[PDB]
Design a protein around this ligand. Structure first.
Ligand SMILES: [N+]
Lengths: 71, 152, 70
DNA sequence: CCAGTCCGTTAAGGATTGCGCCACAT
DNA sequence: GATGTGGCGCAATCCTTAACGGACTG
């Protein structure tokens, strides 16, 4: 129920067109940032896993010295 | 050949053959100087002949090649091509060695395969045929391609 | 080229489908990747907690140890 | 030339992408 | 109201890979 040859339509379109360009770059940008975060987290988690293991090792060792106490 | 065949000659021979046939090559070479009767039939029989199908292989075609090779073996290609209207030996041979032979596996490319390749190409270079010597089920064409666009 | 040519019609239909495919796939990747970050993020928190526990416990014990009478 | 092999290079088509109109969400 | 998002169909472009066209060997 509106005119597509309008000069106002023309500007509305350009407003949106500019907006879509923004939305898509942003997305492309985010999807990128996520993809990188996925790598680093994978790195980090591997690192933590080692710490936990090393910590659980030092803990057991210590736990034994206790029990091996002359009494 | 004598020299490179022009668009005219090609055309002139096509029209000549249409009228006179596939037998009168002594006359047809009278219209095309610089072209012996032998070269004329070869330019047509092996190129211009509009019946030379050079498109995709129907399951029909593929299956027929299988049977024949199955029975007589991967050789005598020219003879096998007589069973595939429109195709010639070379095609039949390639099709079979590259897509029809069971041994050829369609499996995806693994890190090992991808390795021996990166490995060997550094050594032997573009000796596709040789590199394939080290690949259980890969034709030189596959390997060659893989590299070309994969290993940039 | 003339758009009425049946050659065009098919070409388009062929590419349309191919488009909807690339896009339907890209969305799938983008989504599956999003999950991995969630998972890994959960995991990281879970691991950082355990590392907090053990570390504390260890420290607390080392203490009780060097504090032993004799 | 034939009958086999190799290999670089193509090219028909699917796979990507950017663009703009649009309906609908924030 | 205004600006943001997700679909969709084009149409130019890119990439993959069958198999084409030369060059070689016996
Ligand atoms: N043939």
């Amino acid at each position: 129920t509106v005119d597509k040859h309008s000069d106002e339509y023309k500007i509305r379109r350009e407003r949106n067109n500019i907006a879509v360009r923004k939305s898509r770059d942003k997305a492309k940008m985010r999807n990128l940032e996520t993809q990188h975060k996925v790598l680093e987290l994978t790195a980090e988690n591997e690192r933590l896993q080692k710490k936990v293991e090393q910590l659980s090792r030092e803990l057991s060792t210590l736990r034994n010295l206790f029990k091996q106490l002359p009494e | 050949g004598k020299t490179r065949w022009t668009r005219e000659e090609d055309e002139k021979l096509k029209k000549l053959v249409e009228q006179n046939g596939t037998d009168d090559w002594k006359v047809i070479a009278n219209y095309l100087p610089n072209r012996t009767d032998v070269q004329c039939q070869h330019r047509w029989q092996k190129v211009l002949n509009p019946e030379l199908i050079k498109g995709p292989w129907t399951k029909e075609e593929d299956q027929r090649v299988i049977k024949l090779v199955q029975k007589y073996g991967p050789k005598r290609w020219s003879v096998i091509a007589k069973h595939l209207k429109g195709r010639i030996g070379k095609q039949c041979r390639e099709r079979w060695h590259n897509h029809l032979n069971p041994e050829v596996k369609k499996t995806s490319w693994t890190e090992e395969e991808d390795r021996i390749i990166y490995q060997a190409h550094k050594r032997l270079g573009n000796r596709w045929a040789e590199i394939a010597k080290l690949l259980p089920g890969r034709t030189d064409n596959a390997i060659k391609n893989h590299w070309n666009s994969t290993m940039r």
